[PDB]
Design a protein around this ligand. Structure first.
Ligand SMILES: NC(=O)NC1=NC(=O)NC1=O
Length: 166
């Protein structure tokens, strides 16, 4: 976590590099970098929310390139992999029934919608995620695109909030 005044003074490449792990959508980060300096962390976060307001199915698809499946915890030490592992920390990997249910739930979701199941995993157990998956399997395509995008927005914001402090 770096301070706001520090973020405001970074070179364009260093600032974009800092924001890159939040979401695999270069336009989002580029917008934030281009609008520096920010008056406050409050203003930065608000601007960040505004910049994700017009995201659609195309953004969902592009962002999903950097998100592993729930239950498929990455091992890498780099920000992306470390963040995902940390976000899935409430998922019990030792529970064999859960692991199998997650694999089956994922396959079922992917067959239905054509994309990986996306959920803000931070603070959610494997059971909570499974129940969300069961609920979201009943959605129309548009309803599901909307929720998946809402979850993407949450993931991105939490990562941003963890990257830049007051
Ligand atoms: N497929 C996913 O939902 N993946 C993830 N959600 C998170 O919050 N972290 C992930 O890696």
């Amino acid at each position: 976590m770096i301070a706001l005044s520090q973020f405001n003074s970074l070179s364009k490449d260093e600032a974009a590099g800092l924001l890159a792990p939040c979401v695999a959508l270069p336009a989002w980060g580029e917008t934030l970098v281009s609008l520096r300096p920010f008056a406050s962390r409050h203003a930065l976060l608000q601007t960040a929310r505004e910049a994700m307001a017009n995201w659609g199915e195309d953004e969902l698809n592009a962002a999903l390139s950097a998100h592993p499946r729930i239950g498929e915890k990455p091992t890498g030490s780099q920000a992306h992999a470390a963040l995902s592992r940390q976000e899935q920390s409430s998922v019990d990997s030792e529970n064999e029934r859960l692991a199998q249910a997650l694999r089956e739930g994922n396959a079922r979701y992917e067959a239905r919608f054509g994309r990986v199941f996306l959920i803000r995993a931070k603070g959610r157990s494997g059971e909570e995620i499974l129940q969300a998956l069961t609920r979201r399997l009943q959605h129309t395509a548009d309803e599901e695109v909307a929720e998946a995008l809402a979850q993407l927005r949450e993931i991105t914001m939490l990562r941003l909030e963890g990257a830049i402090g007051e």
